[PDB]
């Protein structure tokens, strides 16, 4: 079943509005609703906290403060704490300071605004330089990795390019907002939330309430979008909900209004990247030296892994004999940044990407050959390594880009464009090609495990359950498909159930594009046990050997006789053979050392390429993507439709990141862009007018679920091509380095134009 383009498991339900998300679930009439009241300072001591106006507000029932917290007060996904309710001082504008449970969402919102709070302000750190200045950082100092000796390499280099440039963050904007609900259930709680990580929600709620893990059960059936935004900031909602619940005696739900959501949660780490890169006379890179300043926010969240991944991707798609990264994870008084599709990767990649382009302009070379010339070697003595020392044995980049350029009519188009430009004085088109190599697996190694539990009922139908969470990316269907493929029956007999830490325990968050790779195995593992039992039984019964019992298309065949799967199961039931099983999986071959920067942190890499073409307006910088062509490698895809879709969506999101998406804070730290009316994701019409997406269809070298390949994050990096192209257009307008910053808003583009035009 694996391999066919079947629709998402809740397609119909989405499309008629029966699919329920969290705020849709029915709940008792006495359910309360909650809202945080937030700090209005970027950095201060809290000096007075009068809440009387709060308690007195209509419909309100309980109000909460760090002191009311019965046990832990900490939602951080990492060993250093992050209070859920402020403990004496605040650190960014948005930080929740107390919590309100009233008889209605509005009510709670309204009350949250009546507090009388006095602060003793303090100097605030809002910018990388400020941070740098004040040595405000995480991990007691920057992280440095080095392979070879760069300064040597670069001092003696025929060509060179130094450059510095800004990469702005990005707000997830998941259509369904953060949200959760908790229901006291004799002794313990049951939380429903919209999170990518129920096993953690469990852990944090448990600690928040002083309960052993077994007294807390998180169920989560679907999220309306997550993109990393829900890898951890689901914690504050769950904690508050469980805590209000334990106190008031009653169910408590909490959902952030959009404005709150954007102000409180984190975003993608914005980066400043400073690079020197250099090459040979023939164009082979000689070395690249990089410094990453990354804006993490006021607490650790997942900065640690994120910045590790960006370093880990600083080689972009190329082999480089010497390469250095110095990675500062700067602490600042603003939203605590966190995961976002790509998890650092795009930042590191775009780093190398910008440079190599700068390099190419420098030597009047065509960027594309320059790249193509430095891709890692194809597979099949001594294989090349990355700067962290992992052999790259499966890079099909050379082949693929070639194939893409042909199919995209790359060369010819390039000319048509030059011409067209030369005849225009107000508009310029530009086009670029960018590649992608992304590694698969958590860099924090022991997260790479998954479990599934499978049940077959006497009427032959099946209930599948696994650790992943469906956030729109088709995970469940793939897992259904794998299961139906391994048991030999039609998918229709397989039903998916909601994710539930009481059914599969100790899960990792659904992330690192590892949802399907791993859960897939786990389910397969369960289904294999089950199938095993069936064959054993059939065999003894029909005298003969298990391995000749065949399950296919809903039918079982043995010794010339054949029966319907149901008929087999019923009979195993009568025979008393267990029809239930768990299954589990752990990614092999991984080992690496973060501090040393050496090892094999990944199983295999994902690749792909994209050629985008755009036009810009020389007067105002207005601009847009006319056409894009992608060719991306999803292994032996488990579901081509489902994959094409992630590819298309990711691309858009990726581009979105480098074009109109822009975060802005005011001089006092306030988030100015905190609502769709001022934070602008790709709207329907920004879709490329011609959008060709196709897949490289080749098995994965490594032994993954049906030789497929993760496909959720990788494709997000194809967005770079858009930025690259945007920059090709500026370059066409003058002979200077456009030095286009990201995000490329029109103001930004217009600025690049002028530089290149030499008008300042």
């Amino acid at each position: 079943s694996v391999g066919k383009p079947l629709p998402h498991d809740s397609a119909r339900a989405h499309v008629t509005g029966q699919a329920r998300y969290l705020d849709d679930l029915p709940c008792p009439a006495n359910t309360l609703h909650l809202a945080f009241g937030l700090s209005t300072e970027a950095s201060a001591a809290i000096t007075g906290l009068d809440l009387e106006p709060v308690r007195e507000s209509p419909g309100v029932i309980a109000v909460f403060t760090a002191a009311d917290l019965p046990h832990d007060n900490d939602a951080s996904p990492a060993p250093s704490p992050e209070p859920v309710l402020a403990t004496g001082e605040v650190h960014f504008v948005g930080q929740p300071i107390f919590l309100v449970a009233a008889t209605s969402h509005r009510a709670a919102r309204i009350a949250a605004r009546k507090a009388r709070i006095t602060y003793a302000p303090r100097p605030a750190i809002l910018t990388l330089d400020q941070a740098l200045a004040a040595d405000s950082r995480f991990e007691g100092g920057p992280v440095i990795w080095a392979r070879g000796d760069v300064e040597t390499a670069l001092a003696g280099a025929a060509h060179l390019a130094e450059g510095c440039f800004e990469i702005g963050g990005q707000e997830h904007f998941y259509l369904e907002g953060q949200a959760a609900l908790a229901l006291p259930a004799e002794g313990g709680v049951v939380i429903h939330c919209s999170s990518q990580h129920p096993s953690e929600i469990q852990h944090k709620v448990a600690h928040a309430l002083g309960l052993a893990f077994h007294d807390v059960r998180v169920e989560m059936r679907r999220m309306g979008g997550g993109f990393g935004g829900k890898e951890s900031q689901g914690n504050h909602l769950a904690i508050a909900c469980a805590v209000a619940a334990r106190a008031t005696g009653r169910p408590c739900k909490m959902r952030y209004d959009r404005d709150d959501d954007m102000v409180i949660t984190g975003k993608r780490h914005d980066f400043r990247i400073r690079y020197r890169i250099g090459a040979d006379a023939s164009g082979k890179l000689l070395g690249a030296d990089f410094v990453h300043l990354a804006r993490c926010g006021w607490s650790a969240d997942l900065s640690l892994p994120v910045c590790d991944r960006a370093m880990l991707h600083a080689d972009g798609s190329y082999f480089v004999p010497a390469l250095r990264i110095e990675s500062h994870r700067l602490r600042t008084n603003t939203q605590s940044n966190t995961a976002f599709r790509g998890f650092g990767g795009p930042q590191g990649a775009l780093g190398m990407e910008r440079a190599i382009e700068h390099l190419a302009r420098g030597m009047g070379r065509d960027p594309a050959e320059l790249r193509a010339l430095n891709f890692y070697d194809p597979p099949e003595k001594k294989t090349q390594t990355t700067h962290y020392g992992q052999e790259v044995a499966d890079c099909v980049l050379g082949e693929l880009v070639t194939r893409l350029q042909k199919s995209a009519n790359f060369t010819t188009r390039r000319a048509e464009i030059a011409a067209w430009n030369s005849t225009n004085r107000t508009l310029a088109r530009g086009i670029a090609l960018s590649p992608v190599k992304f590694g698969i697996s958590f860099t924090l190694t022991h997260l790479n495990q998954a479990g599934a539990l499978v049940q077959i009922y006497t009427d032959g139908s099946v209930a599948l359950n696994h650790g992943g969470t469906e956030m729109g990316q088709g995970l469940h269907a793939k897992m259904v498909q794998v299961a139906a493929a391994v048991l030999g029956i039609d998918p229709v007999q397989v039903r998916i159930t909601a994710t539930d830490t009481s059914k599969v325990p100790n899960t990792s968050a659904t992330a690192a594009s590892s949802g399907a790779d791993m859960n897939g195995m786990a389910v397969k593992d369960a289904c294999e046990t089950l199938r095993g039992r069936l064959a054993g039984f059939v065999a003894a019964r029909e005298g003969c050997a298990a391995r000749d019992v065949i399950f296919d298309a809903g039918q079982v065949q043995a010794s010339g006789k054949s029966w319907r799967f149901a008929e087999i199961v019923a009979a195993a039931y009568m025979a008393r053979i267990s029809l239930s099983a768990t299954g589990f999986y752990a990614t092999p071959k991984l080992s690496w050392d973060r501090l040393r920067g050496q090892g094999r942190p990944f199983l295999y890499f994902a690749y792909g390429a994209a050629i985008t073409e755009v036009v810009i307006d020389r007067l105002t910088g207005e601009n847009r993507i006319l056409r894009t062509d992608i060719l991306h490698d999803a292994g032996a895809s488990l579901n081509p439709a489902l994959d094409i879709g992630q590819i298309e969506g990711a691309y858009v999101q990726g581009a979105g990141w480098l074009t109109t998406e822009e975060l802005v804070w005011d001089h006092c730290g306030r988030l100015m862009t905190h609502a769709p009316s001022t934070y602008k994701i790709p709207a329907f019409s920004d879709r490329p007018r011609i959008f060709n997406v196709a897949l490289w269809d080749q098995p994965n070298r490594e032994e993954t679920i049906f030789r497929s390949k993760a496909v959720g994050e990788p494709p997000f990096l194809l967005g770079i091509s858009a930025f690259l192209a945007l920059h090709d257009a500026c370059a066409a307008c003058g002979p200077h380095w456009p030095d286009l910053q990201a995000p490329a808003t029109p103001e930004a583009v217009l600025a690049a134009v002028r530089r290149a035009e030499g008008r300042a």
Partner: protein
């Protein structure tokens, strides 16, 4: 107060006790959980529902629209898009077959927009869906769906609503209005409500003394006059767009990017004006083409040139009890051209809105109407530039040479949308555009085909 309307085929009567409640909330509180809330601010579309009445049917956002507004209309939410017998609408199967959904959450929204589009056979998808953001799919698979389903007979069950109907003040006539407003100067007049609802949903405000104007047929008319066209304050921006398509393509071209179809369908020109925002997109254009505005108080009736309506940021030439009743536009103004610059093209707020109108005496500049939005606490013409422009030759260089004047006409702000340098530089940039455009050069990025 009691109102009635059709809800997914069924007749419904409701006791309004809070006239300010949004349609989005009645709905979910009735358990019609299908309409999602995604921002509650007008931009996402996730709350899109379909209303209908004599003018036909359109899709609008439930989050902006308050109850009293749907009196006597027929409403259709996502849960009633499919036929009673369970058959999917061609638009849903389409979305299913084409993978138009991933996370699901933006879907009911698109389906309702798609359906309503289907019902009227409209096919301008990019503009029709501008107002439905989806963060998951890239949009592409959604266009396929729309296309694929357009070759399919309209849903009969959805047209049957046509046969229908055949605390807070609800005037039916401009007179009734003027009388009452006069007595309650301090009341809160709600038209489209697309700016007013954010006061309740975001500023958490509470408005007592309220009146809804969308039931005054006579305030929402388009009248041909001896000397121009008479536009009633209650005219919807979509409507205004439709009408302009003829005599004022430029204006029409601008409105195309005035919010989204979902807001345009109920947002009013009166409103856009009465709001008084220096980023309104109506006023600049209208001022450029020099229209006039008509106020009204009881039976009295002033009447200035539009630009004069705006004194200072946040303050207008409006008397207690006085209300906007219409505006008047010339029968023609080929000189008009309008520029809207924002971070993103569709559904976005102007960094700067450039509206230009120049009359020629062959090669010579006779008259210069030049207006801008977003470069000052108010929309206003750019006098010094205008001035310095009269009489000179109409070539690029003259204009090039007057630009600096703009920096005296205005001294723009800086903020999340764009930096003052840029807003400035851009205003200037608009005028170069205007010459290059009139001189037949290619200039607009949105007209380039791949």
């Amino acid at each position: 107060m009691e109102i009635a309307f059709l809800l997914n085929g069924e007749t419904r009567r409701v006791r309004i006790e809070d006239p300010t409640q949004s349609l989005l909330e009645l709905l979910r509180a009735e358990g019609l959980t299908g309409t999602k809330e995604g921002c509650n601010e007008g931009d996402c579309g996730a709350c899109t529902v379909m209303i209908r009445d004599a003018a036909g049917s359109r899709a609008v956002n439930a989050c902006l629209m308050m109850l009293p507004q749907i009196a006597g209309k027929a409403l259709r939410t996502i849960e009633g898009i499919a036929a009673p017998d369970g058959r999917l609408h061609p638009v849903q199967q389409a979305m299913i077959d084409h993978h138009g959904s991933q996370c699901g959450f933006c879907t009911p929204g698109f389906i309702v927009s798609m359906a309503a589009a289907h019902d009227r056979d409209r096919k301008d998808y990019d503009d029709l869906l501008a107002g439905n953001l989806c963060r998951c799919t890239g949009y592409a698979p959604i266009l396929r769906a729309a296309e694929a389903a357009a070759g399919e007979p309209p849903a009969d069950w959805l047209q049957a609503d046509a046969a229908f109907t055949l605390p807070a003040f609800l005037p039916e006539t401009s007179d009734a209005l003027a009388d009452w407003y006069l007595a309650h100067p301090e009341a809160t007049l709600i038209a489209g409500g697309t700016d007013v609802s954010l006061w309740v949903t975001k500023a958490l405000r509470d408005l007592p003394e309220v009146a809804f104007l969308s039931h005054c047929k006579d305030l929402a008319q388009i009248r041909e006059t001896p000397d121009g066209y008479g536009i009633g304050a209650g005219v919807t921006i979509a409507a205004l767009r439709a009408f302009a398509e003829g005599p004022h393509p430029a204006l029409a071209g601008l409105l195309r990017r005035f919010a989204s179809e979902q807001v345009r369908q109920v947002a009013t020109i009166g409103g856009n004006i009465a709001n008084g925002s220096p980023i309104g997109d109506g006023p600049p254009a209208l001022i450029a083409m020099g229209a006039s505005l008509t106020l009204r108080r009881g039976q009295e009736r002033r009447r200035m040139p539009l630009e004069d309506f705006f004194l200072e940021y946040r303050k207008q030439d409006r008397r207690p009890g006085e209300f906007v009743e219409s505006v008047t536009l010339p029968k023609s103004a080929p000189g008009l051209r309008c520029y809207k610059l924002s971070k993103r093209f569709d559904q976005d707020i102007s960094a700067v809105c450039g509206c230009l109108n120049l009359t020629l005496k062959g090669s010579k500049i006779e008259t210069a109407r030049i207006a801008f939005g977003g470069m000052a606490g108010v929309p206003k013409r750019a006098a010094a530039f205008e001035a310095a422009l009269i009489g000179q030759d109409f070539r690029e260089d003259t204009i090039a040479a007057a630009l600096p004047l703009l920096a005296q006409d205005f001294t723009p702000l800086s903020d999340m949308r764009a930096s003052a340098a840029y807003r400035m530089n851009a205003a200037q940039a608009m005028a170069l555009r205007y010459v290059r455009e009139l001189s037949g050069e290619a200039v607009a990025v949105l007209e380039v085909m791949p």
